[PDB]
């Protein structure tokens, strides 16, 4: 369907987060990636709508107001650790929503390079075993 499913998911996540940052997209999506975007966008907007206090609480724990390189690295490692602890597709969707809030809170606009790599790094980890994530969001309605 695509050449590499993990790459598709990684591209979709970076694109989505940038879209929620109101950042000009640097790269557009393929036909297949755009299909996955539409599915993920609906799920993540619904999580944001239902669990905003829960995500805001996490952001308080993560001290998202601190955009220093040291604290951004700390946020990355804590999110990666939580994902390794609970690797399910639904968790990955929740984490995408969490990143969206982090970006909306700390005012990320593309120039904080450590934050850009946080987005890249977590997109990479979410994209591992993408087959399971794709099956979850396809069948979520299919």
């Amino acid at each position: 369907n695509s050449c590499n499913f993990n790459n598709s998911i990684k591209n979709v996540i970076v694109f989505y987060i940038n879209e929620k940052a109101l950042i000009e997209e640097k790269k557009m999506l393929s036909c297949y990636e755009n299909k996955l975007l539409n599915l993920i966008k609906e799920d993540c907007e619904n999580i944001m709508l239902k669990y905003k206090p829960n995500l805001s609480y996490i952001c308080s724990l993560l001290k998202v107001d601190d955009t220093s390189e040291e604290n951004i690295k700390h946020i990355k490692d804590q999110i990666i650790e939580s994902l390794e602890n609970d690797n399910r597709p639904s968790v990955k969707l929740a984490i995408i929503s969490l990143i969206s809030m982090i970006v909306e809170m700390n005012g990320y606009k593309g120039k904080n390079i450590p934050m850009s790599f946080l987005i890249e790094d977590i997109a990479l980890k979410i994209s591992e075993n993408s087959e399971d994530l794709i099956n979850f969001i396809n069948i979520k309605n299919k």
């Binding site: 669990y51 724990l61 999110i79 650790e81 939580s82 609970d86 929740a94 309605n141």
Partner: peptide, 26 residues
């Protein structure tokens, strides 16, 4: 880096379980 792993984990678990419930009702 793990000081909040349990607290964050518990929050992710509740959101994930609910998403699974919606999926199960598809």
């Amino acid at each position: 880096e793990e000081q909040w792993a349990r607290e964050i984990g518990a929050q992710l678990r509740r959101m994930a379980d609910d998403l699974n419930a919606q999926y199960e009702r598809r």
